[PDB]
Nucleic acid binder design. Structure first.
Ligand SMILES: [Mg+2]
Ligand SMILES: [Mg+2]
Lengths: 471, 214, 471, 217
DNA sequence: CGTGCATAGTCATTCATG
DNA sequence: CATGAATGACTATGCACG
């Protein structure tokens, strides 16, 4: 047996498969939680294993093996390296993993092997997961059909813009600048109220990228273009001070302090520019780079051109919406994030309401029993099996099924507490909760308002000043 | 380095190209050493359609172990060169890459009917008495699941055993192969140059217009 | 501040530390479970994670990460490679791990990376762990003080001799030949009855090594020396057949079929010997190596000398007893194994007896309640708290503490079953079990007899014909 | 390749020898770049007491970055060469190995008082308000545990790359609060005798040395 | 060239012993 | 130079894009 296929056609299928997987499943972030899958699987798996900010740290390698084993059929290194990025304050704005030990730096030194380091999920990280456990989001099977995985996260905050993301796949690549969590949410909220929102006004809220490495960003015009179209070019200049000497205390995002320094000194030895006179003295708590004819402005101004003390940063904002590559601006990203939070909210409530209704129906039941208690126990005693017990209650006092298991499985000290007042209290509580919920579920404005609250409550907790400045 | 067959006969001996050492192990193990030779590659293969080339160990070795040469000339050395990659999607990329190498350089080899693709299982599902199936991609899975379970997924060839690899995807009695032939040249060149090419501008449009992201 | 130390003294401390750890904790097997620590930690960790022969397989890398994270502060590779040996039928006699995928072979091909393979604990492996969960063996803390680890295994069978072990540390190295589980146990049992046993008689039972690769072993004299002193040299010859051609269907333990073959053909090309005419045709299910002037006996006889078709195997039987390196013979190894099983047995029983006594005291209690039931419930109702409930029972019917929790926490359908006959049945059962146990615990012959039974019950299940032959 | 200090001054600059890149990272990070230079080795070091030698990258580099040479001659290049290894037992072996290299070849260096051993924590134990201790070997641990009583968390550095920058400095590099070991030799005869047994090539005696001297309690 | 996820590999060293 | 646990690292590839 042999099937005869062409070259053209075989080349087609085979490429088409890979092109797809690469785009969705590997490189490109979901527009909703702004996460690539490795990231997602790391968060989910870690949190599932409860490895949270409040509890102790956990040997990264264990973490990696568990992900690989349960969720992610790939190299250890691919996973762990990604895990390490998420622990990189100069790379991510709001970090989603805390690691203890050597995880590289701005000098580019390489992160310590996984058998060394230890990691946990950060605080804000939890907010990405929040309400996961309440059927708020679509699950799939893992590769083995052994256990189910989330396809996206709830996403309490708009991770995508916040922490940016890059960015290389077949046909598409992406770069998205980090942003100021506070500012981002401001925009989100505004759009929630005035959906038909123009960029110019959105800009009043989200004015442009916030880099974790501070720096100076210049190019309002092109920035707008980026936010409108999804593509743009911006200028980023290290932050310069003059001492009486050039003091550098911030450099451009994604740039390598170490090599950056050598490139500067190479300028001196090559004596390519005039007054060139270059030392790096930075330590655990601050960045400092030190640089006759004080043609200083010429030296500095030249440096910007001829080196990476000032670079440009490029916008290619490409995410996955509707299972597909899209290049989008602030408006699509924001809108879609919002709409997500809606489904999440409604799903949350729907699940909560049912949870409520069950214990309510069960409580309603216990209440009735409290009044027939003497006779009820009498019945149970005269009953043959546990099941015979249940079935006799259903026949006589026509309790329901679930009410039966509940009354029967009741331990005994629970009889110590016959007191319909308390049950009534809980019942009042439930009824209040349910009718409140049913509102969100069918009150569309009531729903969006809750979206607004939660977002504000987040903006408050994780809010942080700007670090990058705009010129 | 290669694990060659016993008999040296270019009339009925096959060359099995594999994604690496780990996979290669299972290859060598479940195999009729009479006329089956096995050659590992170190992962993803240089895009030959994008001097850089001949200097790449992995390509250079393929050439030597096959005879012929890049020009080409033929009958060395086996009447089948079979590409056997992991059953996952990265496998398809390597298939893609290897093929454009053959098509680009070793063209007659391809034009002839001496380039084969081997189609090893991805999923195996099971329910003294056992019932077992094999699936080759996600689609296949659903029907298998409905039919049946424990599901096993081969994250690479090194993950199945000797008995399996043979019985499913090497033994000619019960195996099934793909034979790669070209029915234009124009269409071929056109396609390979877009997908594997160097321009991107069009590759993208090809995806956009052709990749069903459902 | 600086402490001034010599070279001599510093060199002393530092070496002395390493020398110790290396000997005990790394290389050398415990004489009781005949396991090096990595091995032990792999078994324990796997089994703890219930990864057993009866249930599905589990992604080795997950396995490795968990060990590394919980028990074993070292390289992934060190651990996984060891895990892979334990999955090697031609290396170990009775295998303690089953792996699915490529785990090397006799041709020496390298095992598939861990991200590929999947593994579980074998069947007999469990017997090494059996009764672990019943406080049968000394536990210690892990490196992190986060969780406790066994210092040795229960060891239902005499793993050390069975699977042999090697073997490299500071000052000491070890090689111990695998042995025939059946035969080994035979010896063990005999010694149990006649402790003052001479080797010559023990030899009647354990006659010498059983290699997993079959082969022919010649040297009874030196073997005895090995079993007596702990050191010896033996001859091992591949098993030869003549076809009308030399057919090889077994080679010597620890020998590399692949290179072995090249070395043979190198003989031909070097034409070092006469009739040299060499092909390897072995497939999944059988070993076969094929080799005018049919000076055949000269060719074969030469091959033995000039190549590894016949080698010698060396005995260096060195294990850890009493926390220290000892070179020992069969008698020490057997004796010590036996004495171990004693502690294990007694500890098992001691723990079982207590478990018994508690439920017995609790059962005895429920029985009493069944007779006061009406009034008891009445009390519970008139009681204020769960605790007030308990305390009132203790005051009135002077039940004990534990009896109280038991009666109180009783669910309700449990009242459906008031029937002192059943409880009495269980009580009879417990009393029988306890008094039986107390015997083993203070009856020394009764104890050794149970040792004999369990050993036989094992010899039966895992028994296997000899594979190596003695000349 | 090495991560050298800013000032090039053989009067007060130190060379930190480390067990590898991962550890080296934390080294470079928590450190006063004014006078602290850092050189990684690839794991276990050639037993110099057992041409094979000089051909071993790891030894050859050490020689070059230090000046002097193997013969020797002195003042290059730092008034301290400090051996900083993982705090576990494999660390002690590397300490052992490095020292016999210095003692064998760079002897005066050793005889002088320019070879140092750095003593970084192995265990850190913890109970807004925090109480923290450091232990250096199993013995130390028991008293620490007893002190901290309940609620403690114990951390064990399976290698230097596992502690942070602040820690490595504050504990084991900053001269104000650090403590170093200075290796001097008070015989030569005793030294040779000892090194040749332990690190030697004969084994027959090494064993007896363990037997008679290693307390396997 | 580097960037971030992926494909898949390799090398030095120790220690005892034939 | 293997052998078995350890110490500690490295290399080639695709993919878009400035
Ligand atoms: Mg693969
Ligand atoms: Mg270390």
């Amino acid at each position: 047996n042999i099937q005869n296929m062409s070259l053209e056609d075989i080349m087609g299928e085979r490429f088409g498969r890979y092109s797809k997987y690469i785009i969705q499943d590997r490189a490109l972030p979901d527009i909703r939680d702004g996460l690539k899958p490795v990231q997602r699987r790391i968060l989910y798996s870690m949190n599932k294993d409860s490895n949270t900010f409040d509890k102790s740290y956990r040997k990264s390698a264990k973490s990696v093996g568990n992900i690989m084993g349960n969720f992610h059929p790939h190299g250890d290194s691919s996973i762990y390296d990604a895990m390490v990025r998420m622990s990189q304050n100069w790379k991510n704005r709001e970090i989603l993993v805390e690691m203890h030990g050597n995880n590289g730096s701005m000098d580019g030194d390489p992160p310590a092997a996984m058998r060394y380091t230890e990691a946990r999920l950060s605080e804000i990280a939890g907010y990405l997961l929040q309400d996961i456990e309440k059927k708020t989001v679509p699950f799939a099977w893992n590769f083995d059909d052994t256990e189910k995985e989330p396809t996206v996260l709830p996403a309490a905050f708009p991770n995508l813009l916040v922490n940016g993301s890059t960015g290389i796949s077949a046909g598409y690549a992406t770069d998205i600048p980090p942003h100021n969590l506070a500012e981002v949410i401001d925009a989100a909220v505004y759009m929630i109220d005035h959906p038909t929102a123009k960029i110019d006004k959105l800009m009043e809220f989200l004015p442009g990228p916030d880099f974790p490495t501070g720096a100076i960003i210049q190019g309002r015009d092109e920035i707008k273009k980026a936010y409108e179209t999804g593509k743009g070019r911006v200028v980023v200049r290290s932050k310069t001070e003059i001492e009486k000497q050039i003091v550098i205390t911030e450099i451009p995002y994604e740039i390598n302090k170490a090599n950056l320094v050598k490139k500067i000194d190479d300028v001196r030895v090559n004596n390519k520019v005039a007054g060139i006179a270059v030392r790096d003295e930075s330590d655990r708590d601050g960045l400092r780079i030190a640089i006759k004819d004080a043609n200083t402005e010429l030296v500095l101004n030249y440096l910007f051109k001829y080196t990476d003390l000032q670079i440009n940063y490029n916008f290619n904002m490409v995410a996955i919406d509707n299972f597909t590559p899209r290049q989008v601006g602030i408006v699509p990203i924001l809108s879609s994030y919002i709409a997500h939070r809606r489904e999440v909210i409604l799903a949350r409530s729907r699940f909560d309401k049912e949870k409520a209704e069950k214990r309510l129906h069960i409580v309603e039941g216990l209440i009735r029993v409290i009044s027939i208690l003497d006779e009820v126990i009498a019945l149970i005693r005269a009953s043959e099996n546990k099941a015979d017990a249940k079935e006799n209650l259903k026949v006589s006092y026509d309790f329901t099924e679930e009410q039966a298991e509940a009354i029967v499985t009741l331990q005994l000290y629970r009889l110590t507490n016959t007191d319909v007042v308390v049950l009534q209290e809980e019942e009042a509580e439930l009824r209040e909760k349910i009718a409140m919920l049913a509102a969100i579920i069918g009150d569309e404005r009531t729903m969006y308002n809750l979206m607004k609250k939660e977002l504000r409550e987040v903006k408050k907790k994780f809010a942080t000043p700007r670090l990058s400045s705009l010129e | 380095k290669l694990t060659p067959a016993q008999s040296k006969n270019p009339a009925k001996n096959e060359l099995y190209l594999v994604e690496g050492d780990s996979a290669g192990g299972s290859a060598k193990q479940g195999r009729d050493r009479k006329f089956q030779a096995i050659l590992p590659l170190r992962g993803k293969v240089i895009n030959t359609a994008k001097a850089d080339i001949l200097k790449n160990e992995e390509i250079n070795t393929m050439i030597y172990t096959i005879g012929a040469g890049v020009d080409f000339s033929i009958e060395a050395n086996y009447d089948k060169i079979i590409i056997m990659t992991d059953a996952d999607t990265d496998g398809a990329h390597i298939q893609t890459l290897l093929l454009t190498f053959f098509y680009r350089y070793m063209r007659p080899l391809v034009e002839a009917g001496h380039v084969y693709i081997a189609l090893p299982p991805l999923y195996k599902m099971s329910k003294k008495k056992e019932e077992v199936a094999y699936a080759w991609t996600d689609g296949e899975l659903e029907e298998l699941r409905k039919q049946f379970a424990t599901l096993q997924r081969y994250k690479g060839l090194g993950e199945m055993n000797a008995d399996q690899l043979w019985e499913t995807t090497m033994n000619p009695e019960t195996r099934t192969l793909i034979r790669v032939t070209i029915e234009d040249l124009a269409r071929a060149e056109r396609r390979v140059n877009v997908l594997m090419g160097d321009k991107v501008e069009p590759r993208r449009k090809w995806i956009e217009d052709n990749v069903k992201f459902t």
